[PDB]
Amino acid sequence: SSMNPKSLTDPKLLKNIPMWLKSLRLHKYSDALSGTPWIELIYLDDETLEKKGVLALGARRKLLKAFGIVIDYKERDLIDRSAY
RNA sequence: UAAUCUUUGAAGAUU
């Protein structure tokens, strides 16, 4: 539901990672992840995500899935300019 | 989720 491209690429959320994470119910990783801007965040890997403090594999899997959706929309030039 | 928490992220727990 919040795991859809329309929701994941909302500029308001992309520009406020704690809130982006909250929508995915992943806000416990906000301290670990919020210092990285979205455009860098979506390209982190499983190994890096764990180094940063995403200790639950299920969480890293959900993160990587959401990231790849954003990437596809970024590649297709389908994220609003106001997110940049 | 009405809310909060857990990871397995579709479910479970608590109030």
Swiss-Prot record:
Q: Where is the SAM domain?
A: 12-73
- Annotated family: Belongs to the VTS1 family.
Highest taxon above the source species: Eukaryota
Q: How does it assemble?
A: Monomer. Binds to RNA.
- UniProt source species: Saccharomyces cerevisiae (strain ATCC 204508 / S288c)
What job does this protein perform?
RNA-binding protein involved in post-transcriptional regulation through transcript degradation of SRE (SMG-recognition elements) bearing mRNAs.
Q: What name does UniProt use for this protein?
A: RNA-binding protein VTS1
What the entry says about domains is: The SAM domain is essential for RNA-binding.
What is the recorded phenotype of mutating residue 28 to Q?
Answer: Loss of RNA-binding
Question: Any extra detail in the entry?
Answer: Present with 3200 molecules/cell in log phase SD medium.
Q: Where in the cell is it found?
A: Cytoplasm, Cytosol; Cytoplasm, P-body
